[PDB]
Amino acid sequence: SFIEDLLFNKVTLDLICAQKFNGLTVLPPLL
Amino acid sequence: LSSNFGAISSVLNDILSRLDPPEAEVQIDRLITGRLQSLQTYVTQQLIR
Amino acid sequence: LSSNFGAISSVLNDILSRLDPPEAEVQIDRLITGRLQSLQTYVTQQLIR
Amino acid sequence: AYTNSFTRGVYYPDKVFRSSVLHSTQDLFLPFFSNVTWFHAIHVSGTNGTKRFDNPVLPFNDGVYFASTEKSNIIRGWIFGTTLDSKTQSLLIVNNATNVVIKVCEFQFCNDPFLGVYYHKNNKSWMESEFRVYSSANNCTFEYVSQPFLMDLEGKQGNFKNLREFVFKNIDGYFKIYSKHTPINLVRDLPQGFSALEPLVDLPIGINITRFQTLLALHRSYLTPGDSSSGWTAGAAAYYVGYLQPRTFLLKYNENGTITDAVDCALDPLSETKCTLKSFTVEKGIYQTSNFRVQPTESIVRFPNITNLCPFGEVFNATRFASVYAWNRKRISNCVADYSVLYNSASFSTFKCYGVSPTKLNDLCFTNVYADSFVIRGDEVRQIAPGQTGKIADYNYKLPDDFTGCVIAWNSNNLDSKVGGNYNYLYRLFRKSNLKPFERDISTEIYQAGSTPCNGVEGFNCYFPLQSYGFQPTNGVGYQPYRVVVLSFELLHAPATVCGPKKSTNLVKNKCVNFNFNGLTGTGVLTESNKKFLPFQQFGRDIADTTDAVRDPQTLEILDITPCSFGGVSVITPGTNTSNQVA
Amino acid sequence: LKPFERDISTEIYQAGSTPCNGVEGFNCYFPLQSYGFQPTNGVGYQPYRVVVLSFELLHAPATVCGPKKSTNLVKNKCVNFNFNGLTGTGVLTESNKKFLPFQQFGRDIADTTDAVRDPQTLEILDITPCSFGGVSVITPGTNTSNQVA
Amino acid sequence: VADYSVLYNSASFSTFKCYGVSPTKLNDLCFTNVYADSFVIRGDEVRQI
Ligand SMILES: *[C@@H]1O[C@H](CO)[C@@H](O[C@@H]2O[C@H](CO)[C@@H](O)[C@H](O)[C@H]2NC(C)=O)[C@H](O)[C@H]1NC(C)=O
Ligand SMILES: *[C@@H]1O[C@H](CO)[C@@H](O)[C@H](O)[C@H]1NC(C)=O
Ligand SMILES: *[C@@H]1O[C@H](CO)[C@@H](O)[C@H](O)[C@H]1NC(C)=O
Ligand SMILES: *[C@@H]1O[C@H](CO)[C@@H](O)[C@H](O)[C@H]1NC(C)=O
Ligand SMILES: *[C@@H]1O[C@H](CO)[C@@H](O)[C@H](O)[C@H]1NC(C)=O
Ligand SMILES: *[C@@H]1O[C@H](CO)[C@@H](O)[C@H](O)[C@H]1NC(C)=O
Ligand SMILES: *[C@@H]1O[C@H](CO)[C@@H](O)[C@H](O)[C@H]1NC(C)=O
Ligand SMILES: *[C@@H]1O[C@H](CO)[C@@H](O)[C@H](O)[C@H]1NC(C)=O
Ligand SMILES: *[C@@H]1O[C@H](CO)[C@@H](O)[C@H](O)[C@H]1NC(C)=O
Structure with a gap:
């Protein structure tokens, strides 16, 4: 929606590669 | 992982490339107990959060 | 802070006044890991409460 | 087969x-449903088929499972050894009857690794004839002769009823033989009979074992028209190797209390799920057991090409x-130091060090090496040590507490103790302050003991600090001149120069290998690096202190290290009561 | 070599990467060099006679050890018993389940011995720490009374 | 006063070991009761005390 779009842009959630190589993975949510 | 924790180094590949098992096992024990303590702290914080 | 934790004393001023750095560092490491464990336990209890 | x-x-x-209990053990086992090589030593029943005879050489890995199907005690014994010659010892086992006689004595019968059970005419029946095929000198150490006397062969042509399971594993110069016996039914393969192997025999042998051999008893009735060994039509025993x-x-x-069931931890993903969950009841749902780790293919070693021997x-x-009060600095730079001669030249009374280990000195590289050689008393040899407070050696020579490098000491009685008095060896006896490890006070002044200026005059409490050593030619044990030399191995990550040469394998990209760059035992893929590396040392680091970008010493190519494909398995399984198929 | 392997073999050494088959020349030396001993030499060159013992502490029926008093077995009484170093303190009973014909030692999940066998005889024994509970002082405040339960 | 400088000047001892105070800091430390036991032993017994 229009208001939902304004929310997914002001959070935004390589360091991720460094964590992945050391075994610190991030699972994806079911939903 | 960038913490000496009392050992003469901080990476597992530069301890076994310097010392022998009977003397490297104490350094590995130090490193592993330190890292296990850190990971347990992280897990406890994650559980509380 | 009044716990030996394995070291031959309980205060850091009576270890560096007896032993030398290369042999006092092991006693200090014992004391510091014990005290850090106690403080981490206190912090975890405070977080739960 | x-x-x-x-x-x-x-x-x-x-x-x-x-x-x-559901115990979790780690030792040398045989994975389930793997290839086990059938050796069917059946008697050839046709004129066209080949003579089935199985006594082949089998390489001996760190452990070996053996199985013998049997109905008439045909298969008897086993033999080991590195090369089966007069140079290396060769174990053996003999089972001529119920008694179990064995040996370790090296007997060379490479042409005829056989055994003979020939049909005796006197009271004609299936008797044993030749239990001795040994054709060499012994020159051996161990012996064992167990003699429970019972003569039994009982030749038969029926189904293979018995089977003996063995495990021959060696480690730390010890040989362990696990054994168990089971009445089997099937004749063509191994039946589904589960049991474990109780240990029976442990022997100290101290011999490098790499090969393996077996003994078969082949000889038949005299009524056979021809040679009973070349022609035999009654052998049916078989054995399996794993x-x-x-x-x-x-x-x-x-x-x-016996092992009823067992599960592998790498056979199947559901097997790994049971391995992790520590039970045989795995319910529906996703499980996370291990990580998809790709093992390295080869082992790159990168040491500088040049082979200039270091002036050791x-x-x-x-x-x-030079004396202790003024010691020299031998800087060894840009050369190869082969420590094999430093191992061949083994005449050192005391050799200690607290940094690197002597085992890894050969396969390690150094960037800066400095040698300090001098001569000290017999009781001072223990006093050149980090942290060791010296009664007189703290003014003279101290070692850093962070010192890394090895010290060498040996008796210089034949070179530095002579009838010439050798008073040219001096040392400082007292000073107003104690020196720091790598500082030498070569200065020689007067000592103002007693708080009085003794400017130029040596009187009471004005003694000369630089006192010559009280050496004597061929003195007692505690006063001999011990000649020592210390090495300060600078382990700071700088371009390594002083070390032995190993094979310089060619560079390979996009293939994670167990590479080794001057001790950097990393296992990751290599790539070209876009970011310009430093003109200085060939080492790089990151937040986690795991090397990411390096540079080869031989070629100035900026290499990028990255651990190869790592992920995580997640066994998707329904209830094991329903099925065993997983995703 | 590895610790408990002895290379009794005596071959020729191909130092310098050349086959010295049967000939002792430059970089073809004999590996088996005799000790340069000397009758009553200096301190650093004297022959030292050594012997090492491998005390195999693996849990197997103990055979080689000094003699200690063999006290008679007692049932339903926890004692500070000692079976070949097993300094356990618990009651002893007969064991119903058949024990292994091998070593006199047993274990459980908590790595504390539960079933053993006697050295001198061949009777199976069950070890169990004796009556253990926990006190719980049920008390009112100090000033109202001192009697507890 | 136990001035250990002469005990450092007179350096002729084959074996000097201890597990408590360090010889570096023996000079700048104070003691309450000092008891000395002097005796003589074999050549193979020196490591045994
Ligand atoms: C134990 O025996 C094996 C026999 O396979 C030895 O392997 C030899 O290794 C040398 C050095 O690389 C090679 O030149 C030989 O060719 C190898 N033997 C064979 C038959 O190929 C091994 O070195 C011995 N020692 C140890 C500790 O394993
Ligand atoms: C055994 O080896 C054969 C090769 O002939 C192969 O086809 C088979 O997959 C292997 N494993 C089993 C369990 O048969
Ligand atoms: C070692 O040095 C001494 C000098 O005293 C010399 O006599 C001897 O020949 C040398 N040995 C070798 C193997 O270089
Ligand atoms: C001067 O030369 C002598 C002779 O080699 C040497 O022993 C001394 O260390 C040097 N330095 C001083 C300060 O005397
Ligand atoms: C010498 O260095 C070059 C440059 O990397 C390398 O390709 C070559 O293999 C080296 N020589 C040997 C004998 O390894
Ligand atoms: C298997 O077990 C699950 C869990 O109890 C149950 O829901 C299912 O009905 C069982 N299936 C069979 C065939 O027993
Ligand atoms: C032991 O094996 C026997 C087989 O005769 C069996 O009856 C028994 O249930 C098993 N378990 C125990 C504890 O005896
Ligand atoms: C040890 O004691 C057992 C049980 O009393 C007995 O059967 C055995 O013969 C004894 N062994 C001796 C006396 O050597
Ligand atoms: C202790 O005394 C107070 C009065 O000061 C009383 O109220 C209290 O009940 C007493 N403690 C108990 C356990 O009764």
Whole structure:
């Protein structure tokens, strides 16, 4: 929606590669 | 992982490339107990959060 | 802070006044890991409460 | 032929009762349903088929499972050894009857590794004839002769009823033989009979074992028209060999206390799920057991091409070593230091060091090396040590507490103690302050003991600090001149120069290998690096202190290290009561 | 070599990467060099006679050890018993389940011995720490009374 | 006053070991009761005390 779009842009959630190589993975949510 | 924790180094590949098992096992024990303590702290914080 | 934790004393001023750095560092490491464990336990209890 | 192992490869690692526990053991086992090589020593029943005879050489890995199907005690014994010659010892086992006589004595019969059970005419029946095929001198150490007397062969042509399971594993110069016996039914393959192997024999042998051989008894009735050994039509025994693998089994005991069932931890993803969950009841749902780790393919070693021998011949034995109050600095730069001669030249009374280990000195590289050689008393040899407070040696020579490098000491009685008095060796006896490890106070002033200026005059409490050593030619044990030399191995990550040469394997990209850059034992893929590396040392780091970008010493190419494909398996399984298929 | 392997073989050494088959020349030396001993030499060159013992502490029926008093077995009484170093303190009973014909030692999940066998005889024994509970002082405040339960 | 400088000047001892105070800091430390036991032993017994 229009208001939902304004929310997914002001959070935004390589360091991720460094964590992945050391075994610190991030699972994806079911939903 | 960038913490000496009392050992003469901080990476597992530069301890076994310097010392022998009977003397490297104490350094590995130090490193592993330190890292296990850190990971347990992280897990406890994650559980509380 | 009044716990030996394995070291031959309980205060850091009576270890560096007896032993030398290369042999006092092991006693200090014992004391510091014990005290850090106690403080981490206190912090975890405070977080739960 | 080749077959699959159904219920074989399990033995009590360390015998404990273990009443009804699901133990997790790690030792040398045989993975289930793997290739087990059928050796069917059947008698050839046709005029066209080849004579089935199986006594081939089998390479001996770190462990070996053996199985013998049997009905008439045809298969008897086994033999080991590195090369089966007069140079290396060769074990052997003989089972001519119920008695179990064995040897370790090297007897060379490479042409005829056979055994003879010929049909005796006197009271004609199936008797044993030739239990001795040995044709060499012994020159051996161990012996064992067990003699429970019972003569039994009982030749038959029926189904193979008995089967003996063995495990021959050696480690630390010890040989362990696990054994168990089971009445089987099937004749063509291994039946589904599960049991473990109780240990029977442990022997100290101290011999490098790499090969393996077996003994078969081949001789038939005299009524056969021809040579009973060349022509034999009554042999039917078979045996199976399995190369043991380093596994991690999960062993489920029972109320009785024997291993009833077992599960691998790498056979199947559901097997790994049971390995992680520590039970045989895996319910529906996703499980996370391990990570998809790709093992390295090869092992790159990168040491500088040049092979200039470092001048270590003039640091150990020289004409004159300067005294302790003024020691020299031998800087060894940009050369190869082969420590094999430093191992061949083994005459050192005391050799200690607290940094690197002497085992890894050969396969390690150094960037800066400095040697300090001098001569000290017999009681001072223990006083050149980090942290060791010296009564007189703290003014003279101290070692850093962070010192890394090895010290060498040996008796210089034959070189530095002579009838010439050798008073040219001096040392400082007292000073107003104690020196720092790598500082030498070569200065020589007067000492103002007693708080009085003794400017130029040596009187009471004005003694000369630089006192000559009280050496004597061929003195007592505690006063001999000990000649020492210390090496300060600078382990700071700088371009390594002083070290021995190993093979310089060619660079390979996009293939993670167990590479080794001057001790950097990393296992990751290599790539070209876009970011310009430093003109200085060939080492790089990151937040986690795991090297990411390096540079080869031989070629100035900026290499990028990255651990190869790592992920995580997630066994998707329904209830094991419903099925065993997983995703 | 590895610790408990002895290379009794005596071959020729191909130092310098050349086959010295049967000939002792430059970089073809004999590996088996005799000790340069000397009758009553200096301190650093005297022959030292050594012997090492491998005390295999693996849990197997103990055979080689000094003699200690063999006290008679007692049932339903926890004692500070000692079976070949097993300094356990618990009651002893007969064991119903058949024990292994091998070593006199047993274990459980908590790595504390539960079933053993006697050295001198061949009777199975069950070990169990004796009556253990926990006190719980049920008390009112100090000033109202001192009697507890 | 136990001035250990002469005990450092007179340096002729084959074996000097201890597990408590360090010889570096023996000078700048104070003691309450000092008891000395002097005796003589074999050549193979020196490591045994
Ligand atoms: C034990 O025996 C094996 C026999 O296979 C030895 O392997 C030899 O290794 C040398 C050095 O690389 C090679 O030149 C030989 O060719 C190898 N033997 C064979 C038959 O190929 C091994 O070195 C011995 N020692 C140890 C500790 O394993
Ligand atoms: C055994 O080896 C054969 C090769 O002939 C192969 O086809 C088979 O997959 C292997 N494993 C089993 C269990 O048969
Ligand atoms: C032991 O094996 C026997 C087999 O005769 C069986 O009856 C029994 O249930 C098993 N368990 C125990 C504890 O005896
Ligand atoms: C070692 O040095 C001494 C000098 O005292 C010399 O006599 C001897 O020949 C040298 N040995 C070798 C192997 O270089
Ligand atoms: C001066 O030369 C002598 C002779 O080699 C040497 O022993 C001394 O260390 C040098 N330095 C001083 C300050 O005397
Ligand atoms: C010498 O260095 C070059 C440059 O990397 C390398 O390709 C070559 O293999 C080296 N020589 C040997 C004998 O390894
Ligand atoms: C298997 O077990 C699950 C869990 O109890 C159950 O829901 C299912 O009905 C069972 N299936 C069979 C065939 O027993
Ligand atoms: C040890 O004691 C057992 C049980 O009393 C007995 O059967 C055995 O013969 C004894 N062994 C001796 C006396 O050597
Ligand atoms: C202790 O005394 C107070 C009065 O000061 C009383 O109220 C209290 O009940 C007493 N403690 C108990 C346990 O009764």
